[model samples]
Target: EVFKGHNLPRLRGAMIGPHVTNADLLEFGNVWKANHIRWQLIWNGFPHSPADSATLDEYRQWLDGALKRLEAALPVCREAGILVTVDLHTPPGGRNEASECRIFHDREFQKAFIDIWEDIARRFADSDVVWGYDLVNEPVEGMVPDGLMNWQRLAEETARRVRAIDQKHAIIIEPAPWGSPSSIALLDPIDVPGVVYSVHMYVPHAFTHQGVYDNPVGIVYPGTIDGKWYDRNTLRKVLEPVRRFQEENGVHIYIGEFSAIRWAPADSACQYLKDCIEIFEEYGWDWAYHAFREWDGWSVEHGPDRNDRNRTATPTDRALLLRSWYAENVKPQFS
Candidate 1:
């Protein structure tokens, strides 16, 4: 593991938007004072491509632009001493095993992914702030006809590709179903040294993420979790298996993506955050908020908010009272 023992202190961070400008990055960086940030999601498809998949020319344009933006953002983050984790968030099957979305089904996508990451790692070989590469976002069943073994191959090949260019930074990979424990057994052993396993934690999902007012996931209300569910005791119970998996595998566990809705009452969300922070401290895991700021007004799609405009992370929202919130609640200092 790249970070080990007390010296590797727990870290607090959040994800940032893809294709963000330098000024926007600097502004968010200062606001969060976070130790890490997932700079961008390298997607297999384009935002407005009419086809479910991008045409070859369109795909090339997307990858080229994303690659340039990530390389550009690295230096800005480095100056602030913040670690940057690059997310290869293949929509259908990047890393998630249970994801309903499936990008790995396309052989063309697979080749493009390898080619893009190869260039990415090589281009940033000298960067110090590159926390690592999040090999894929979420994977769901039957997406990769190769099945579980296909994921293993993807990881093995991708890791080899990235390491060939830059072996200095750590690498974070997740299981299918968005890293849910249920799919953990489907993966083969990860061979890299600074490799960390990532999982998205939202168990009792009905409570934590399912019913979140604006949740587009729109799990039927009856199936949703009614309210905050991660108090200390509940948090500890949920973490047991995660701890067991890491211990058994001799790997470090990090939550690559985790978050409560901005629409949840401020107090409840803060309590949820506090409980989450305490557990990470006790366990020595690294985590980042699923997002740093609010979703763009134009981006919201029936998420757990009255409207997209209503859910942004403004500079003065009580929910974002980070200074006092972190100081009074989180027990460990950011690494």
Candidate 2:
């Protein structure tokens, strides 16, 4: 039981609620009924041009502010029965498209990465409100992996270091290439007690992420996708790596992020989320929806109307589907 009665989670809450809330809002738990929230730390500017990324000085300042925000959020979350998982979304090096950042290639950045976790773990070690220390958000290790700065070794080193000061919270390690389940299949499990493995599920990205950028729109779920017929069973196959990893290792798995574009045709995105959540529950893995109130594209509160994203649309099929489960949250008690 990862959280008292809850099973290993998005590793925050399962029995309490099949879902965990993420970065967007703390009131989300109050409104959406989630018992866990994943808070992110981003120092890199969006659209991720490394040239314009935060300098070391700026990075520290941002880190300071973000940690202070976490300090503030803990009490709010605790009061709401929501446990928090701190996510290092954009680390010291920065978020570069399709490739690993300097955190893997540059030794200095690597030390900074370790040191950041050390500070977070020590700071929140005594807080019951914090759930875990998500070491990295989505690490995309481009081909030709570095033998010296192997992420596995580095993760264990950081986990070990954190354990030295704070063993109360779990340490989350996301696998390579943006936490792909295939990457988790290849991940070597660490021996530590409270270490959990994670993967961001967006299999058949062509469907889930369609039209987000250059990908075409109108690619419906449970339909022909990327050349094959897809449905709930197909989704199961797509998530086999995660299922296999969990059953084989007996380690808790966290679906750090999973969602289809809100504008997907015919309420397909909702169906996709439903299928994924069922799969996640069947496997007893913890999950957090791709977002709470992040971008309109992934926001559940937003409606399926693509033509006018800003306009208010009531009781979307997506939100209703989630509420059916979210309403089941057993509701944690921090005190």
Q: Evaluated with lDDT, which candidate comes out highest? A: 2
Identify the candidate with maximal TM-score.
2
lDDT of 2 by residue, 1-335 (tens): 43222332333332112122433345566767777767766543332634225676777677897688778767777667677778887778675554566677666677888888888888998998887888987776554345546777778888899888886887888987678888887688886668888888888889998887799888888899978999999989888988888878778877877888888889789999999999988987777776666567877777766666773557778778877777777666655
Model 1 stretches astray by more than 4 angstroms:
1-8, 19-21, 42-51, 91-103, 141-143, 146-149, 210-230, 296-335
- lDDT of residue 82 for candidate 1: 60
lDDT by residue for model 1 (1-335), tens? 43432233655676676755676666545654566677655563322222234465675666667777777777777554467777766432233333343356766656766777787788777776676788777654455565333667777788887877776877777886557755666676677566777777665555445334345443331222455434568767766777777778877777776655444433444455567767776777777766655343212111335344554444333335444433332222333
Q: Go through the candidates in order and give each one's C-alpha lDDT.
A: 0.59, 0.73
Clashing pairs in 2: 9-286, 10-286, 10-287, 16-329, 16-330
TM-score of each: 0.76, 0.90
TM-score attained by model 1: 0.76
* TM-score of model 2 (CA atoms): 0.90
